[PDB]
Amino acid sequence: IIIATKNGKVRGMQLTVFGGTVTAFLGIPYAQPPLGRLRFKKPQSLTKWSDIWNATKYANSCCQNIDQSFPGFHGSEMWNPNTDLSEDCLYLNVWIPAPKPKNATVLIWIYGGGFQTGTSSLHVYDGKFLARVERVIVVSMNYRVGALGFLALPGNPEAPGNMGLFDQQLALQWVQKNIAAFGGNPKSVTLFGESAGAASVSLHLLSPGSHSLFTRAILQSGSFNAPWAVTSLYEARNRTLNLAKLTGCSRENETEIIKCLRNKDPQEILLNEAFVVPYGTPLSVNFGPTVDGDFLTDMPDILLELGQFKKTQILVGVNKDEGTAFLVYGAPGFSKDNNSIITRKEFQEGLKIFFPGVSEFGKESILFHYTDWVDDQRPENYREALGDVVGDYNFICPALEFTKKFSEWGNNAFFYYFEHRSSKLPWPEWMGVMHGYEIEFVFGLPLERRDQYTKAEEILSRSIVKRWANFAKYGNPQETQNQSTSWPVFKSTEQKYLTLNTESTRIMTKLRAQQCRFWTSFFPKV
Ligand SMILES: *[C@@H]1O[C@H](CO[C@@H]2O[C@@H](C)[C@@H](O)[C@@H](O)[C@@H]2O)[C@@H](O[C@@H]2O[C@H](CO)[C@@H](O)[C@H](O)[C@H]2NC(C)=O)[C@H](O)[C@H]1NC(C)=O
Numbered sequence: 001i002i003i004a005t006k007n008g009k010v011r012g013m014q015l016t017v018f019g020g021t022v023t024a025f026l027g028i029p030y031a032q033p034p035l036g037r038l039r040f041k042k043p044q045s046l047t048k049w050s051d052i053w054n055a056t057k058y059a060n061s062c063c064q065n066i067d068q069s070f071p072g073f074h075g076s077e078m079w080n081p082n083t084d085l086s087e088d089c090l091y092l093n094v095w096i097p098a099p100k101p102k103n104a105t106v107l108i109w110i111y112g113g114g115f116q117t118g119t120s121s122l123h124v125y126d127g128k129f130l131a132r133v134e135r136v137i138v139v140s141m142n143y144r145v146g147a148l149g150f151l152a153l154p155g156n157p158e159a160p161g162n163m164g165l166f167d168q169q170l171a172l173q174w175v176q177k178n179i180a181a182f183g184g185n186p187k188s189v190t191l192f193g194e195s196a197g198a199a200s201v202s203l204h205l206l207s208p209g210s211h212s213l214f215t216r217a218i219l220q221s222g223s224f225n226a227p228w229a230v231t232s233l234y235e236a237r238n239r240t241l242n243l244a245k246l247t248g249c250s251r252e253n254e255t256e257i258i259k260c261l262r263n264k265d266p267q268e269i270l271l272n273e274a275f276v277v278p279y280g281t282p283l284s285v286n287f288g289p290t291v292d293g294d295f296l297t298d299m300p301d302i303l304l305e306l307g308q309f310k311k312t313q314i315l316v317g318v319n320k321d322e323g324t325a326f327l328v329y330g331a332p333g334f335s336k337d338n339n340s341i342i343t344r345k346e347f348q349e350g351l352k353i354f355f356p357g358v359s360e361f362g363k364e365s366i367l368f369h370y371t372d373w374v375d376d377q378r379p380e381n382y383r384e385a386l387g388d389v390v391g392d393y394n395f396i397c398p399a400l401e402f403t404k405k406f407s408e409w410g411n412n413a414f415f416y417y418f419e420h421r422s423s424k425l426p427w428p429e430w431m432g433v434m435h436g437y438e439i440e441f442v443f444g445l446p447l448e449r450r451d452q453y454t455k456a457e458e459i460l461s462r463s464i465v466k467r468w469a470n471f472a473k474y475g476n477p478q479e480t481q482n483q484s485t486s487w488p489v490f491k492s493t494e495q496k497y498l499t500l501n502t503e504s505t506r507i508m509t510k511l512r513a514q515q516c517r518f519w520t521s522f523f524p525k526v
């Protein structure tokens with residue numbers, strides 16, 4: 001099958017899924033390759049072609065540093081890129097149901113990776129189950145990460161910042177101009193993303209240039225008000241200069257700095273990225289979104305507080321154990337290979353690692369709030385406290401504050417709390433329901449019975465896929481047929497959320513109320 005797009009014809013491939021057929025277009029380009037004089041610049045328009053483009057295999061993933069903290073360990077390496085790294089990586093993928101739909105709702109996926117890593121060709125990001133089972137069209141794109149995507153000299157168009165976000169935005173533009181030719185409705189487009197991807201989705205809610213490119217939005221374990229998500233103009237400039245010094249590109253004319261960095265090999269930029277910050281944590285975002293004056297016209301906390309964003313429905317949620325994954329990447333006493341029982345002194349050492357530029361009193365307040373033991377004789381007490389500190393501060397409390405702030409302006413919002421630790425995961429049990437552990441359930445991998453998942457997990461993923469699809473089509477994430485718990489809207493007063501698990505789906509209220517009042521009200525002062 002061939003499809004005629006605004007820039008030329010493209011050829012796809014057929015996929016047998018669950019006794020049916022999905023058509024896949026892997027690797028359509030959506031911008032001029034950002035090479036040479038184009039490195040660090042906004043993505044440039046793609047000039048037509050007269051031939052048939054073969055969209056039949058995933059394209060190159062963008063340049064990035066690979067995670068090698070556990071070589072040969074599937075739990076980390078399944079997130080490493082699975083196609084060639086290259087600066088020529090501005091490509092996207094399309095999964096359309098067969099037979100060609102007539103006006104299908106589109107789901108657009110934005111992967112995370114701390115704004116430094118990630119790629120849309122990962123196995124857990126395969127859109128074919130969602131297209132087969134729910135008849136939505138799934139789209140995903142590669143966008144530039146790290147310094148190649150977010151190096152910032154604010155004002156200077158040679159390196160204005162936010163290039164990865166403008167990559168995402170240009171791919172959404174492609175969906176507006178082209179997806180009807182695939183049988184999709186450009187007027188029913190839902191963005192969804194996880195971690196830095198979720199943060200990216202929330203920034204598309206703020207950026208006026210994105211407001212007409214999508215309908216609704218789904219935020220999984222991530223939002224732009226998280227402490228890691230937005231870099232100040234101060235830090236962005238300092239870090240760009242630290243990178244120029246690290247590569248001998250230090251000049252006085254700032255444009256001549258950008259020209260000097262353009263002649264460095266992609267690798268040489270990648271190797272020095274890590275050292276532009278003085279103190280780093282497992283959650284560092286060396287090069288990330290900034291207030292560029294273009295994509296972000298003001299500091300996003302101000303735009304949230306004052307209601308400056310797209311008015312629409314949102315679906316937001318978090319996992320029970322967001323913080324645990326990061327503890328084995330540097331906290332003393334922790335290991336994926338033992339139950340990581342830490343002492344009080346090890347907990348305090350852990351805080352120094354995750355809170356380097358915090359005052360001494362700051363660290364003492366975290367200690368005080370989180371070690372008032374109900375039972376001090378539990379040896380996992382400190383182990384669990386440090387995970388909860390990292391998870392509440394970095395993910396859960398910013399997600400709730402974003403949802404409260406957002407709903408206060410009249411829009412329907414739905415909040416979930418994902419608490420299933422799946423059956424086949426390679427990380428140990430003490431890490432619980434880890435960051436990223438819901439992606440496979442959202443994409444419907446447990447719907448594959450040969451994939452070593454339990455039956456309860458197939459049921460959970462089936463219900464989640466239905467709710468996500470109903471949210472994208474209708475703005476309302478119910479499973480209306482199989483006698484399911486209704487999912488109430490999240491209001492600022494009552495703060496009802498839905499829990500997702502294989503046992504009992506429950507309505508609860510005011511998630512982490514005492515912990516988030518600490519982080520969101522007391523702590524930012526320090
Ligand atoms: C495809 O459907 C759209 C309408 O989509 C629905 O309405 C949206 C506002 C949004 O809520 C979606 O989730 C819905 O599924 C049709 O749009 C109409 O287009 C005509 C042009 O002929 C226009 O005059 C109408 O005002 C539009 N209706 C709207 C905006 O509701 C569109 O034509 C459909 N196209 C095909 C080929 O089926």
Ligand SMILES: *[C@@H]1O[C@H](CO[C@@H]2O[C@@H](C)[C@@H](O)[C@@H](O)[C@@H]2O)[C@@H](O[C@@H]2O[C@H](CO)[C@@H](O)[C@H](O)[C@H]2NC(C)=O)[C@H](O)[C@H]1NC(C)=O
Nearest residue numbers: 328329330331332333334335336337338339340341342346
């Ligand atoms: C759990 O292991 C940590 C990490 O130690 C490493 O991984 C282990 C699985 C094993 O292969 C060790 O030999 C490795 O060093 C242990 O913390 C270490 O403790 C030693 C003293 O025994 C100390 O010298 C190291 O600096 C520690 N390493 C770190 C990263 O803190 C920890 O003691 C183990 N915990 C439990 C409860 O068994």
Ligand SMILES: CN(C(=O)Oc1ccc2ccccc2c1)[C@@H]1C2CCN(CC2)[C@H]1Cc1cccnc1
Nearest residue numbers: 075076079112113114195228282283284325435436
């Ligand atoms: C891939 N991997 C990773 O990239 O996680 C980071 C790394 C740095 C971050 C900095 C700030 C904010 C969030 C960050 C997240 C994480 C890492 C820990 C837990 N499993 C396994 C390894 C992954 C979860 C995941 C999967 C896809 C996208 N995201 C996260």
Ligand SMILES: *[C@@H]1O[C@H](CO[C@@H]2O[C@@H](C)[C@@H](O)[C@@H](O)[C@@H]2O)[C@@H](O)[C@H](O)[C@H]1NC(C)=O
Nearest residue numbers: 001010011012013014051052053054055056
């Ligand atoms: C693009 O692909 C064309 C056809 O691909 C081949 O034929 C189809 C029917 C499938 O079986 C497919 O897997 C085969 O590889 C080629 O003829 C054409 O040269 C390709 N264009 C390139 C490589 O630039």
Ligand SMILES: *[C@@H]1O[C@H](CO)[C@@H](O)[C@H](O)[C@H]1NC(C)=O
Nearest residue numbers: 238239241242276277278279
């Ligand atoms: C950048 O930050 C580093 C670390 O804080 C510091 O040493 C340096 O003075 C800052 N400024 C410049 C211009 O390098």
Ligand SMILES: *[C@@H]1O[C@H](CO)[C@@H](O)[C@H](O)[C@H]1NC(C)=O
Nearest residue numbers: 158252253254255256257259
């Ligand atoms: C910096 O370089 C640019 C690009 O060549 C040039 O237009 C500008 O005059 C230079 N400015 C200074 C102060 O050297």
Ligand SMILES: *[C@@H]1O[C@H](CO)[C@@H](O)[C@H](O)[C@H]1NC(C)=O
Nearest residue numbers: 459462463464466479481482
């Ligand atoms: C509803 O229940 C039936 C069995 O009674 C099951 O096969 C089906 O997939 C379920 N659907 C959803 C959307 O959960």
Ligand code: NA
Nearest residue numbers: 494508509510
């Ligand atoms: Na209550």
